[PDB]
Design a protein around this ligand. Structure first.
Ligand SMILES: *[C@@H]1O[C@H](CO)[C@@H](O[C@@H]2O[C@H](CO)[C@@H](O)[C@H](O)[C@H]2NC(C)=O)[C@H](O)[C@H]1NC(C)=O
Ligand SMILES: *[C@@H]1O[C@H](CO)[C@@H](O[C@@H]2O[C@H](CO)[C@@H](O)[C@H](O)[C@H]2NC(C)=O)[C@H](O)[C@H]1NC(C)=O
Ligand SMILES: *[C@@H]1O[C@H](CO)[C@@H](O)[C@H](O)[C@H]1NC(C)=O
Lengths: 49, 55, 6
């Protein structure tokens, strides 16, 4: 499952895996907003390519 | 490791090899209560100290 | 600390 994979990936950077399970919806919201900001600041005329 | 289940009983294994064991308080740690984890499961956590030690 | 008491 995806949440268990992300919890194991928090162990690699030195955070215990209960920090993901206790903050799962906040982390999902921050990811879903960061992808949208990537899409916004790419869709406009900021030629980063 | 991870928690697994053979259909009825719950074990704990390592991630890269199947080697199940009995869930005690030496394979686990405790942080919080059971109303914030999405997908929690009722089971028994065995204690390796009380049933052998009385005196 | 207290839990060896019988
Ligand atoms: C799931 O694991 C449990 C734990 O080993 C199995 O229970 C054992 O079943 C055997 C039958 O072959 C008995 O001799 C043991 O005494 C049982 N152990 C305990 C602690 O009850 C159970 O059979 C497994 N289930 C499946 C479907 O494999
Ligand atoms: C897991 O265990 C808890 C603790 O017994 C269960 O919570 C109880 O559930 C019953 C039935 O819904 C309620 O009548 C009790 O008031 C609950 N007690 C507490 C302290 O929450 C929970 O339902 C169990 N979950 C499963 C899937 O078995
Ligand atoms: C996991 O998915 C099933 C359907 O595939 C769903 O019924 C269940 O509620 C899901 N588990 C959780 C904890 O939401």
């Amino acid at each position: 499952p995806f949440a268990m994979q992300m919890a194991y990936r928090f162990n690699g950077i030195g955070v215990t895996q209960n920090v993901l399970y206790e903050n799962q919806k906040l982390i999902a919201n921050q990811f879903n907003s960061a992808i949208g900001k990537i899409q916004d600041s790419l869709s406009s005329t900021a030629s980063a390519l | 490791g991870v928690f697994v289940s053979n259909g009825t009983h719950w074990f704990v294994t390592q991630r890269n090899f199947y080697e199940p064991q009995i869930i005690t308080t030496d394979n686990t740690f405790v942080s919080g209560n059971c109303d914030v984890v999405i997908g929690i499961v009722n089971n028994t956590v065995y204690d390796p100290l009380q049933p052998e030690l009385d005196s």
